Amino acid sequence: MELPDYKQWKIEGTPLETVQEKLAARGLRDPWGRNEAWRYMGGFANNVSFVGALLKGFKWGFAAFVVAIGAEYY
Amino acid sequence: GGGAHIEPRYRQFPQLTRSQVIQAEFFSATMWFWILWRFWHDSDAVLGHFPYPDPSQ
Amino acid sequence: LTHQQKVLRLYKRALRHLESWCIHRDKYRYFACLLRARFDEHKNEKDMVKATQLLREAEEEFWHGQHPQPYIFPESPGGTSYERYECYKVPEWCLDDWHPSEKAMYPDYFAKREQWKKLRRESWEREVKQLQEETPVGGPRTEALPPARKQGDLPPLWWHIVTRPRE
Amino acid sequence: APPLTLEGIKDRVLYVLKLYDKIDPEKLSVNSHFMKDLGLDSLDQVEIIMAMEDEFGFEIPDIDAEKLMCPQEIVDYIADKKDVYE
Amino acid sequence: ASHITKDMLPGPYPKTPEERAAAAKKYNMRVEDYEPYPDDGTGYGDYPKLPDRSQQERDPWYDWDHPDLRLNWGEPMHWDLDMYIRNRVDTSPTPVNWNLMCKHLFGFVAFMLFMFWVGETYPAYQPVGPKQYPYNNLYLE
Amino acid sequence: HAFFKAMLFMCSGSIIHSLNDEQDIRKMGGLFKAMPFTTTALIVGSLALTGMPFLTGFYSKDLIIEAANTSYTNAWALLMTLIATSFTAIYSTRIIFFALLGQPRFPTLVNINENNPLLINSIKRLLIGSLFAGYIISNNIPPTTIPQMTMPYYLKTTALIVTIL
Amino acid sequence: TTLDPAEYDISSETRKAQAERLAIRSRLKREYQLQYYDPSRRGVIEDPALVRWTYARSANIYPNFRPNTKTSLLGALFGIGPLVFWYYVFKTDRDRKEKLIQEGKLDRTFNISY
Amino acid sequence: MNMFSSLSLVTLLLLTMPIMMMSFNTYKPSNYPLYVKTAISYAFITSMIPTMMFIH
Amino acid sequence: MLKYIIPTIMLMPLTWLSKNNMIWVNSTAHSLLISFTSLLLMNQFGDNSLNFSLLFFSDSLSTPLLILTMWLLPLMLMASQHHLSKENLTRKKLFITMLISLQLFLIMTFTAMELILFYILFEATLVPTLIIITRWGNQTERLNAGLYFLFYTLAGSLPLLVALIYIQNTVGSLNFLMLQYWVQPVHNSWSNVFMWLACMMAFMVKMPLYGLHLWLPKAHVEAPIAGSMVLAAVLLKLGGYGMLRITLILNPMTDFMAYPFIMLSLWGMIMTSSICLRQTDLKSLIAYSSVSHMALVIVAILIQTPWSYMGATALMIAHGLTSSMLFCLANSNYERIHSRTMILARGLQTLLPLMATWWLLASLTNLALPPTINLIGELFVVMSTFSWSNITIILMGVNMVITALYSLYMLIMTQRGKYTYHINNISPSFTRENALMSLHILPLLLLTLNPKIILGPL
Amino acid sequence: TPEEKLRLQQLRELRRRWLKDQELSPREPVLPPQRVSTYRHSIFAFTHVLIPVWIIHYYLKYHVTTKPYTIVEKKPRIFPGDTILETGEV
Amino acid sequence: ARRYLGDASVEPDPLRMPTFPPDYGFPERKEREMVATQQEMNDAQLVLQQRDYCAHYLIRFLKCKRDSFPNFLACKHERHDWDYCEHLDYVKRMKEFERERRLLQRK
């Protein structure tokens, strides 16, 4: 019900949030960074990949492709 | 409402029903088995070619 | 439109048209104070043309590059599915003529109907009495006294007090 | 199809107080009136709801500025707009 | 049934301050950019003194417009200027009057010079001259 | 073609209801945010729309662009048809790169749901009927014309590489 | 392209005492809302902005009208104007079409309709 | 051979029936999309029968 | 007519003879009973021809046109009762009797056996119409419109008498259309122009050209109780058909000067429908639709050689049923909002759902959706004047374009909402409001099954 | 703003007060009132399709012998495999 | 079309031909022509642009489509042989510009 209890996110990963580190020569500084990093962190670094996503990992890429071939064949 | 069988979230990634992924992974296998007759056996152009018919005299 | 809130109505859209331009989420967020830095140049000074050149040159670089089909917040003056709930549209007080055996259903809602009308049918001895007094001759916007000094009934009663709910 | 109650709107408005690094979790709950620690003229009147501009953000018209001083007066008419609690 | 100031009269210089507003509050005190002087094009019977035309135009802007309604749905009291063409008006776009649309079809207008030629696949342009000979040169043998 | 978009409108129709409205290519996120089935159905038809490596309308698409091979055309027509095939490829990954790739960005209360078997009965019939459509239709049809069946060197198979780029 | 449409300009302090033009429309709205709310009306309000919109458009153009100009005598370029041109076309057909129909033939054997 | 189009006019005539029964001839316990979804469900398999008769 | 006139005069000493408020039910009861007898002996066969009895009837043989004339007295009494029931019974007995007295002369008209019996009955009207225009209207501009309805119809019709009496003592006698076997032709002269022109121009004043239509949005705009003679005045306009009786014979070979009647009525067709899209009076919106695709018959009669008479007859009773009902759609929905301004009636389509179908199936007959009696009428006119010159498909095609955008503009003004006002407008379109709105489309789409009944000779 | 502090706190005591009245299901106030009152797949399916095919055939076999043109069927499209040679494959 | 002589019957739709209309024909090697039987080509319901060469091999090819009715391939190798009938026909036609480029040069 109250799942976003504060002091939960507390930037540790989310390499998007190293851009706030980039402005250290500029300085803003503190407010605020935890808005866009709501669901940037967590288990949301799954983040499906290159052509292997449209291959779906090339998972069954040759699965029964060679398993059917072959017998009889005399 | 009446039935909360899929709950709302606060970005905690509500998951699947642990049976949808079976039908999901089943229809990637049926198409990459269907690359069978794409290569074995079907080539680029099964026609035969001409060997440059210059000597016509 | 005062000069105090002249920048503010431009300030809300200066970031709003920006976020339709980005592709990441941090791309907007890394540009947040960066967009604020140009806006924080002139902080505290006069109100004349000394400071109107913040605005008189804000036509360029805001209208120039202004929102190539931006995000529209779909329930809005524009944008899709904004005024779409209209096949129902809540035709409130269409319940005048029934020729009953159709007034059989909801016996309690028709019971509660005649109760609320006493505030509607009888408020004109009180609300319209001060309405000639509180409004001096022809003055600006016609809101009443916000409690009407004993009981605000309403003045907006009941078309703004019992208006159409959305679904 | 999903309904809503009034206990969720009291938390999200209160949470983005804590999400801002300019404001500590030591200010008042419903009425700090935003002048307790205002500044500037700009960016403490529209930026204070710029976080909810992304979250709730149903285009939030020009009237919404000076009513939003009282931080309970924000909570008042969000229930009026989106067809909310009883 | 209202007979006093039913409509206009043969104006538009019949002491214009008496018109808007005796009724028909187009102007406040005949300096409002809508005093009933605007008979533009006298000699035409159209638009007399007329709490009416050439007033500012192009839209009910069909948006927020929030005193309550103020534009086209919700009917304010006296704001009709000219209508029946304002059912679905628009506004200025991001560019203005760079007619690249006729220039967009001009690309095939240059490629109408490619309609003069043919598209034979075999062979290519063949830089020989009068040695292409697309149909026939000599007899059967 | 009739099996393509009545799938694909209905495929994305589960998505618009899933966020309850945006229908924008912005503010979407990645593919698998508990969306296993329809993203798998998206990468079939949008791969069919690439230009058919071995998919459904390969017997409709390839046989016509190689029916314009030997022709008396405008010679600006093949400079307008075959160039349009390359533009059909960036149609595919665009909805991938905004709705099926990126980090999850959209306003909160993730109210997604996909388990109504009315939709699951809908897609599972058409996706199976999609794949084996032309391999039954074109396999069982009277031929009415004489095919081309000639395509020499450096002029023949680049129409796939038109789609690859 | 139709039109500019002049969405920003200047002020402050060109004629700063121009205010209370809202006092006109607030007077109308205080007149209207007091008219619109009542417990027993059962019928529309007159609102003579419509009445002056029809009656100054339906009638009151011909009692207005004097032919003092030539831009109301412009209508001979618009009324009898194109009607001259449609006669010029239709007698070139049905005459050039007629001579070919009599001198020589153009239609075939299976022209029963017509 | 006489059943080539005799089964095909079944397809062009059956779809009129959920408009005829829409004029209140003792309608179903309501669920009215189910009546039409099953109305098409038998109209498809009738239409495919002369398609096989053509390809012979 | 053996005796169709003889029962319908017997309707007249039934109304005053009756009791109190029974006078509505007594008149509408018996008036429906003629519709069997009207059909009964008529529609017989059929191959050259049915001369009927005597010097009083040629039975309206090849142009039926008369069954529609007999629907209306049991169609208008149910329509007129909306705002009439505040006057005295002594005048309520009057307004039923002159309405029957208008149907009496129309019955001996359209059949008429002659050409001089036609005229005296062609002019036997316009006295009982004018009584319905001047008395029983609304606020003023009745009285000038009562005079614009005269002095066009009567200024033109008097040079008929100069020419019809001229024929009666030149070539035999005109008394029969079947003594018109001996017809001398009419060549090119300077007196035979005027014989053609005076005999024709009195028909143009009723079915209008683009010029001299100036009386048509006067009588229909300011109009009786609920379209009560406006339904009659649309039949009376198409009851100037007699150009089909005259010009087929009786100067047959003057097409030489048809051209100022063609181009005036073929370019006027494309403009007088275009000049209505900015109307603000709702009953004047329909009143210009009645100008446009009535004037398509004027280029369909003067162009001879059928495949046009196939269509020119079907167009006379195309909008005989359509434009009647559109006036009935506007004679209703004025009893509830007391203005005919089309702006004001918004917020609708939620409040009155059952009559949404009555708007559309009206306006779907101008779009005309080919299996009706409408696009079996236009597509014979189109395929006729194509064979005059090929270029006429352009103007007549743009005629089809603009009236598509024109008919929907009257529909789509009711699909809006929030209604802003209107504590009135409660009445949920009662049993009478749908009954007299029915019996229009119920014969209109019925006759599309076998429309061989609607055809000329041809 | 000091003015609407008194305002809009009574509006919730009017709007939501009516909206308190608006949510209304006491004792299911649809009466309806009066009155009363998978496997088969037997009478639902047989009534739909099986009856008109009996009808529409009857206006078809009794129709080809009446109208002087029935259905206008084409020819058999036969190859030389009945009474002719092949002849190669030369 | 190799002959340009008269036509006895006035039957259009160029079945009134010398025997059989080729695409060009013949022209050199061979200078001859020939095809199937025109009395069978009209007996077989077959459209134009199918009375060219390799028709008799195709008239026996597509017969097995019905002679093997619930089949997937009547003869897939003969389809590669009818294409080999077609490709040998077409490369015979491709030697135009091998000759016409050179035979139009001087000598």
Short mmCIF file of C-alpha atoms in Angstrom, two decimals, chain E residues 135-136 139-140, chain K residues 1-4 18 20-34 51-53 89 92-94 96:
data_model
loop_
_atom_site.label_atom_id
_atom_site.label_comp_id
_atom_site.label_asym_id
_atom_site.label_seq_id
_atom_site.Cartn_x
_atom_site.Cartn_y
_atom_site.Cartn_z
CA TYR E 135 15.48 -3.18 -82.71
CA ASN E 136 17.15 -4.39 -85.93
CA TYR E 139 18.19 -9.20 -92.48
CA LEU E 140 17.54 -12.80 -91.44
CA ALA K 1 4.16 -14.52 -86.28
CA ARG K 2 7.10 -15.76 -88.36
CA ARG K 3 4.92 -15.60 -91.49
CA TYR K 4 3.29 -12.34 -92.57
CA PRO K 18 0.99 -18.72 -88.78
CA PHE K 20 1.66 -20.29 -82.97
CA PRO K 21 2.73 -16.73 -82.07
CA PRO K 22 6.11 -16.57 -80.30
CA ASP K 23 7.47 -13.58 -78.41
CA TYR K 24 9.69 -12.75 -81.36
CA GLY K 25 10.72 -16.00 -83.12
CA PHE K 26 12.56 -17.87 -84.45
CA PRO K 27 15.17 -16.15 -85.57
CA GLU K 28 18.52 -17.68 -86.56
CA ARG K 29 19.49 -20.89 -84.73
CA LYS K 30 17.05 -22.34 -85.18
CA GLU K 31 15.40 -20.44 -88.02
CA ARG K 32 12.41 -22.76 -87.52
CA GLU K 33 9.73 -22.60 -84.81
CA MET K 34 6.86 -25.04 -83.98
CA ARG K 51 0.88 -20.56 -76.07
CA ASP K 52 4.63 -19.86 -76.24
CA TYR K 53 7.43 -22.43 -76.06
CA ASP K 89 14.67 -20.75 -74.03
CA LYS K 92 18.66 -18.43 -76.41
CA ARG K 93 16.81 -15.10 -76.52
CA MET K 94 19.50 -13.29 -74.51
CA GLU K 96 20.34 -10.65 -79.23
#
